[PDB]
Symmetry: C3
Subunit: 293 residues, 3 copies
């Protein structure tokens, strides 16, 4: 007779969850912000929230086995509130279980591993409240969860009963009207990984940019705004016109497209077919790089 | 270790079963204060109980609603008609004229909710969209008032009202309605929500669909009856200090007599049960 | 048809443990001044509850789920761990909280919190074991609480925290409400483990209090310096000075200043133990007679 337990996922994933400390020196060293981190690979690279290590003079990463390192900011993305830290480990490193094929379903039991209020590594249990949750940028595409999330869980791991990483705890719903209960958000591992591999490889996230604002007869993304001196404006794209296709790919979803654009190497001239006056217009556009925050 | 072969503990089953039947209710009213623009006064949830399109929700979610918009997770949006409501149970039935069919909430009448039963709350907290939260049945028959509640620690928030509370199986257990807010030290209560038991919910719905309202028996009254309504009590000759048997039967009572059809007579004093005026 | 399937439930744990969890009412007159929860450990009628719950009680009324009500007598109160043992007269027997000494609490274990939140009645909130050995809200005290995200509210104090099997895991004691940034903590409660809980109970049943070894020293973290040396204390008579580093105590090295202050508490007052210290770069094995901790 064994008690129902998620200790398995705990022993599997908890080790790979670290305590990330941001400290600054003031007229000496003191912690200005603390959160959590998730060791993804053996190389020592760690994913965390950018808002955890912002303006960090020194980033201290504390593991559960006692070891304490000095993290190296590999890069950060304010667009997805993500950041990667590097740590040189001569000894073996615990990694987070990752299943790229795993599709998180609503209702899956999840565990939130982090360091709430610097009490130590806390494991809270909940489920996946929802998926594909945005919030305006729409880049975050959060997974909602009712697993107890608190200040110190940011950058922490959200794993299932198998210990497999599901997301990176980033947000707790704070909006009144009272105090929101059991509503937290996390970056899907699919996105967290995509950003990590890109931060390590480029020192930052490099995104294509058409300088267009639009929201999804023919089916296409409608343009609402056109960034001045932006690739769109330059090419001759207008707000009212409807984008049928982008770079030889159907503009079926405003969100799946913006992801396709972000993958275009800046400096690339791509076709963008639109619809003005019920007439198809093919406009060649030059991809810039996404403007700095 | 490889977990690809492994299967994660998931209540997705209950979700695919129940969720599609839980709808987003939008209490909308023209803003007379401004320029008569339609605005969402209140948003809660609803539960589609049968194929006919009868949806259960909280009365407090549709009060003072100039328009009641029901949105299904499948995208569809209907202008729900208020079939009826009940202040006492805070329940309300809506109706949607769907040409096609529609999802219904899994209901198991013979299912008895137990304290400890894993439950899932399905609603639209803060209009984020259909949110699922997990908890358990913390208690039963919680209630002051005469109401009977399933208590639950499943995280409940504004917008969950009228939403479905279900078990692992996805069977409707209760209708999320309330949330403990009262604070002794100014602190906010944690994991203390309340739901209308589905036995009570279905009962109130079927009545509302039939009578447009919930007509329940009225008597006008070691249990001593201090005073007597100028009605069914006053008749038959029931005294003020009058003192054991009702309808050949031994809170248990006022819920029993409430289910007595008006016009029916029950003894020896012989009183005729009528309709209890509510509003 | 789902009507033939089985609902996931922790009702099993509820039936085994719930009855044993009682409502503790603290009375004072200028009526109920305070209230909480209790757990019946033994058939004798001994109940465990938090000290704060029962403090300054002119009368302690206990109420069982089966209906019976008794006036409890306070066996003892331990300020340190915030525990209190109660006594009542039991006829026809009582429900007892299932305890498994062999069972070891595991982080991630599904735990039910049984208690009387806001006097709503016996409430069962579900969560897991977040962590073990936690200091609590305050670093001092070597609390060793079990952390749990199972909803814990006022009225669960002295209540039973149990696993899905129904085995007692800990006594719900504290909830985290500390606020910075305007934060409201969510799913962070603390409970005194059952093994610890059982241990304290006996020291209270055996004696109207808990006695722990004292050494008249206040230090910080290898070795452990000595910032303060209690006057006429065990170490005071031993000649232990200030600023001197400690290496080992009672044959047990002094790595952690927390695992050590727990060992010293175990040593029966009076016993004589060895204490090695590095002073001026020299090893000095001293002899100190342990005394009971100041009242």
């Amino acid at each position: 007779e064994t008690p129902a337990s998620y200790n398995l996922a705990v022993r599997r994933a908890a080790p790979a969850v670290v305590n990330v400390y941001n400290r600054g020196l003031n007229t000496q060293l003191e912690i200005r912000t603390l959160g959590s981190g998730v060791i993804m690979d053996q190389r020592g690279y760690i994913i965390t929230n950018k808002h955890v290590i912002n303006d960090a003079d020194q980033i201290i990463v504390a593991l559960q086995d006692g070891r304490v390192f000095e993290a190296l900011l590999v890069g950060s993305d304010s667009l997805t509130d993500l950041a990667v830290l590097k740590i040189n480990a001569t000894g073996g490193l615990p990694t987070i279980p990752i299943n790229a094929r795993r599709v998180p379903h609503i209702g899956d039991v999840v565990l939130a591993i982090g360091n709430p209020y610097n009490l130590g590594q806390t494991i809270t249990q909940g489920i996946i409240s929802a998926t594909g949750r945005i919030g305006p940028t729409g880049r975050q595409n959060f997974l909602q969860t009712d697993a107890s999330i608190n200040p110190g869980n940011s950058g922490g791991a959200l794993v299932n009963s198998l210990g497999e990483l599901m997301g990176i705890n980033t947000l707790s719903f704070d909006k009144s009207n009272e105090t929101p209960e059991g509503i937290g958000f996390a970056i899907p591992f699919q996105l967290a990984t995509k950003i990590m591999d890109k931060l390590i490889r480029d020192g930052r996230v490099i995104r294509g940019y058409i300088g267009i604002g639009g929201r999804e007869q023919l089916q296409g993304i409608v343009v609402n705004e056109v960034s001045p001196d932006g690739p769109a404006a330059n090419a001759g794209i207008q707000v009212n016109d409807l984008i049928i296709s982008v770079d030889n790919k159907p503009a079926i979803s405003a969100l799946e497209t913006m992801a396709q654009v972000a993958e275009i190497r800046p400096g690339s001239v791509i076709p963008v077919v639109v619809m003005r006056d019920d007439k198809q217009l093919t406009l060649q556009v030059t991809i810039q790089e996404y403007p700095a925050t």
